[PDB]
Amino acid sequence: SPHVFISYSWSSEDHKEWVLDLANKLMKESGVEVILDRWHGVVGHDRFEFMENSIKIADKVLVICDKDYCEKANTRRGGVGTETMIITPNIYNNTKQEKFIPISLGEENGEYFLPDFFKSRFALGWNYEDIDKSYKELERLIWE
Amino acid sequence: SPHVFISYSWSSEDHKEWVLDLANKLMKESGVEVILDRWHGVVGHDRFEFMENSIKIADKVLVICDKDYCEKANTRRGGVGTETMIITPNIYNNTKQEKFIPISLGEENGEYFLPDFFKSRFALGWNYEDIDKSYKELERLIWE
Secondary structure, eight states, X not given: OOEEEEEOOOOOHXXXXXXXXXXXXXXXXXXXXXXOHHHHTOOGGGHHHHHHHXXXXXXXXXXXXXXXXXXXXXXXXXXXXXXXXXXXXXXXXXXXXXXXXXXXXSOSTTOOOOOTTOSSOOOEEOOTTOHHHHHHHHHHHHHO | OOXXXXXXXXXXXXXXXXXXXXXXXXXXXXXXXXXXXXXXXXXXXXXXXXXXHHHHHOSEEEEEEOXXXXXXXXXXXXXXXTTOOOOOHHHHHTSOGGGEEEEEOSOOTTOOOOOTTOSSOOOEEOOTTOHHHHHHHHHHHHHO
């Protein structure tokens, strides 16, 4: 099975629910073993360590790039500090590049959200009007 | 400006013309420096070494993945002929991964053509019904 860690920001309760629904769906319908912070009982100050360690054991890393994740990633408001949950340039540059599957949420005109330090600009443009098509491509990016 | 090498096979005269048109368009409309075999006068059995040298100086590498390219890549892998400009497992694995911009041609149902040894499964699904959208995204993958 693909081991898939999901990197995401707790932008809101609805967004946490969208990520949780995606994790449950990947586990149920796609035979993927999702590494999710909510399913490991990760306390606030253990978040950076959990993200760091999870990326090394995961086969794929979903980068949930909504607007809040991308400008938190680009600015790094105080820098790393255990709280973090957002991939840093250092983590990105010490990870095999093929693991990352950026998913852009809420962009317009195909200007997919993606942190500036991602050298490859590919991202799965999530189609809210065609979920099944976007989910199919996510399965291909994970499995194939 | 980005130096963009185009990896493609001479599958047919129409396909060579499609790649030639794309190369001309990228230079004219997107201000990129395209490294094209026909513009350097690379004759058939010199093409593979030309691909190797060009990928080292190129900023991006477009992988024109139609059916013929992907089946020869999947079947022959590192054993592709000296006359070919088809990426091998060694070339993919020994090149900075962000260079590669695979373009899937002629795939159906979102089952994008891509050699199986490409560790990252991302590819630009070329939309023959919305070229401007596909060219917009190709420009972004090259520039951004």
